[PDB]
Amino acid sequence: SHHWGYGKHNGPEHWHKDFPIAKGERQSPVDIDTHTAKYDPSLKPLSVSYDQATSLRILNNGHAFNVEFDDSQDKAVLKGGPLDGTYRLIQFHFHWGSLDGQGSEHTVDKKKYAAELHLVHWNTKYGDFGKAVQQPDGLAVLGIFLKVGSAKPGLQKVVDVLDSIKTKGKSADFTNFDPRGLLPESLDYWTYPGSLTTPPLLECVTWIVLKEPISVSSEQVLKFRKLNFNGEGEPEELMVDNWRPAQPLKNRQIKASFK
Amino acid sequence: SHHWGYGKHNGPEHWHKDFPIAKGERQSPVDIDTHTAKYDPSLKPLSVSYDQATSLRILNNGHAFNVEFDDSQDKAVLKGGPLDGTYRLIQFHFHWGSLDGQGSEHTVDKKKYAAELHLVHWNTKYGDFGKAVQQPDGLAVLGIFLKVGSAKPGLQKVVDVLDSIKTKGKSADFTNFDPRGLLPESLDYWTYPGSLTTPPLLECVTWIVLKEPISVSSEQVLKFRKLNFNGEGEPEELMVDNWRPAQPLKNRQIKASFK
Ligand SMILES: [Zn+2]
Ligand SMILES: [Zn+2]
Ligand SMILES: [Zn+2]
Ligand SMILES: [Zn+2]
Ligand SMILES: [Zn+2]
Ligand SMILES: [Zn+2]
Ligand SMILES: [Zn+2]
Ligand SMILES: [Zn+2]
Ligand SMILES: [Zn+2]
Ligand SMILES: [Zn+2]
Ligand SMILES: [Zn+2]
Ligand SMILES: [Zn+2]
Ligand SMILES: [Zn+2]
Ligand SMILES: [Zn+2]
Ligand SMILES: [Zn+2]
Ligand SMILES: [Zn+2]
Ligand SMILES: [Zn+2]
Ligand SMILES: [Zn+2]
Ligand SMILES: [Zn+2]
């Protein structure tokens, strides 16, 4: 009851109590039905420029873990696609499950994936992250599905450091990470106007969800599930099933960048 | 810069940036000038009923440390004085300095004390703490000055447990504490309508500041100054000088319960 989370008492089901936007017109995530999400030839190609991405630190905030980036220049930026502007990378994080058969927030024809990677960018138009989240086109989030298969070499440096931030509030220096190690072979995508998938659930996100999932080993996802929602000294609550289920699409169109 | 505190960058001096109420009509603390704070015979005597006070836990929130109480019944209550209602004890905490010559928030004829004890109560009229802080008579805070002299036996159990919550976010079970061990010989007091002395600086507090200070040993206050503002693993910032200086009294009267 204390403040929001993913348990029986404080979960997605109950977020409408302190956040009436939870039942709003533009909520995320959604289910991407491939028969309705039609192709849009007006969509320009997406330009992911991460070659100068400068990571700083990894931390556990009690809700997931974030790798944070220097956002002071156009070092890691997101351009074109459905975006009018330059969007700087500020952090990324994951949502995952207690079983391989669940963990993703978005779904494709009702299929759930073992996890989902969210790379979070803010529109430089507004000046900083804080001002951007108060505008409907302030954020662009790039969402990537994880399936249990073979190991992702780009993910291993993250996994190695997870013991050092087991409990809420812990953090660590995490430099020279290259977020390109987490991208799939193709950048074909769906896009729709949405929201943050956690409180305050603000409807300020242009979603870009990649068609092609990345593969991670079962050994690597097991490492995610040893994390803790709780602080050190408090009772153990395993950080698992930290995902919001799909929401009503309502009067929105999911445009597709592909065939 | 990150979020508020007591350093050069984030201190009381700069709180007006995110909190315009900091320059409001009813801000606390104030200096109690004894020549103007006249006696009011209409003030009923103060009734401090702490015999059934049930403490639960002690924690470091990064700004000070709080001992928290069961507020579910009328076990520890504050009545009469300038209060119209029953006020339940929810927590207490301290503000102290880096030197014995400072640490208090309130002052008496410009004199500063080594520390100050704040016992925090909410009006049962409103139902819970959260609803109370949004009303001008929602909170009653009982403020007590500490001077460096001989040891306070009632304070020693708090001091013993301080090693176990050195850094921000740590907490511990803290049961069978009796807050009566921190009261002075006399309950003669000054009262005025004010605010929280930390953000969000809400103007919802009826202040009751006791005339008579309590004595604590230098050994006991040294133990306060080993605490840390920071979390575990972060760079060391000693939790000292965590006090707001005196504010303009403006169109307010400080009533005195005594001679
Ligand atoms: Zn339920
Ligand atoms: Zn409901
Ligand atoms: Zn379909
Ligand atoms: Zn590149
Ligand atoms: Zn939280
Ligand atoms: Zn996310
Ligand atoms: Zn470092
Ligand atoms: Zn290939
Ligand atoms: Zn393609
Ligand atoms: Zn530790
Ligand atoms: Zn200054
Ligand atoms: Zn200023
Ligand atoms: Zn005077
Ligand atoms: Zn009593
Ligand atoms: Zn804080
Ligand atoms: Zn205080
Ligand atoms: Zn316990
Ligand atoms: Zn005596
Ligand atoms: Zn008296």
Which token pair is B6? 């007591």
Handedness of CA A12, A13, A18, A20 (dihedral sign): positive
- Which are the contacts of A127, defined by CB distance < 8 A and separation ≥ 6? none
* DSSP letter (8 states) at residue A158: H
Kindly give the distance from the C-alpha atom of residue B243 to the centroid of ligand 11, in angstroms, as a whole number.
Answer: 15
CB A198 within 8 A of CB A244: yes
| Strand B171-173, strand B46-49: pairing | unpaired
* Chain A positions with Cβ closer than 8 Å to B: 168-172, 231-234
Element (H, E) at B58: strand B55-60
Say how far apart CA B117 and CA B122 lie, in whole Å. Answer: 17
A172 strand-pairing partners = A58
Return the closest-CA partner of residue A142 out of A99, A194, A98, A96. A194
Say how far apart CA A99 and CA B229 lie, in whole Å. Answer: 39
Omega before A235 within 30 of 0, i.e. cis: no
Q: Looking at the 3D structure of chain A, how many domains does it have?
A: 1
Q: Please measure the distance between the N-terminal and C-terminal CA atoms of chain A and give it in whole angstroms.
A: 46
Tell me how crowded residue B173 is: count the other CB atoms within 10 A of its CB: 10
Residue contact B232–A170, C-beta within 8 A: yes
Please give the annotated binding residues of B for substrate, written as ranges: 197-198
Say how far apart CA B96 and CA B59 lie, in whole Å. Answer: 16
Return the closest-CA partner of residue A116 out of A96, A97, A139, A141. A96
Structure resolution, Å: 2.9
Say how far apart CA B195 and CA A129 lie, in whole Å. Answer: 31
Any known ligand binding at A198? yes
Query: H helices within chain B, ranges in order?
Result: 129-132, 156-161, 218-224
Kindly give the distance from the C-alpha atom of residue A243 to the centroid of ligand 17, in angstroms, as a whole number.
Answer: 30
Which token pair is A255? 């445009």
Omega before A200 within 30 of 0, i.e. cis: yes
Which token pair is A116? 């989902």
Say how far apart CA B221 and CA B214 lie, in whole Å. Answer: 13
Say how far apart CA A6 and CA B137 lie, in whole Å. Answer: 36
* Chain B positions with Cβ closer than 8 Å to A: 168-172, 231-234
Say how far apart CA B124 and CA A19 lie, in whole Å. Answer: 26
Query: H helices within chain A, ranges in order?
Result: 129-132, 156-161, 218-224
CB B208 within 8 A of CB B183: no
Distance of CA A112 to the CA centre of its chain: 15
Say how far apart CA A185 and CA A182 lie, in whole Å. Answer: 10
Say how far apart CA A17 and CA A199 lie, in whole Å. Answer: 11
Kindly give the distance from the C-alpha atom of residue B157 to the centroid of ligand 17, in angstroms, as a whole number.
Answer: 16
Tell me how crowded residue A129 is: count the other CB atoms within 10 A of its CB: 17
Closest CB to B171 among A168, A171, A233: A233
CB B58 within 8 A of CB B22: no
Say how far apart CA B37 and CA A253 lie, in whole Å. Answer: 67
Say how far apart CA A179 and CA A166 lie, in whole Å. Answer: 22
**At B164, which CATH number?**
3.10.200.10
Q: Which of A2, A3, A16, A63 is catalytic?
A: A63
Distance of CA A61 to the CA centre of its chain: 14
Compute the radius of gyration of chain B from its Cα atoms. Answer: 17
Q: Tally the residues of chain B.
A: 259
Closest CB to B231 among A169, A172, A234: A169
3-state secondary structure of A21: helix
Say how far apart CA B239 and CA B105 lie, in whole Å. Answer: 15
Positions of B marked catalytic: 63
Which token pair is A250? 């309502």
Elucidation method: X-ray
Any known ligand binding at A93? yes
Return the closest-CA partner of residue B198 out of B9, B2, B10, B1. B10
Query: H helices within B154-196, ranges in order?
Result: 156-161
Tell me how crowded residue A123 is: count the other CB atoms within 10 A of its CB: 23
Structural domain boundaries, residue A65: 3-259
- Selected for mutation to probe chain B from A68, A128, A170, A174 (highest B CB count within 10 Å) is A170
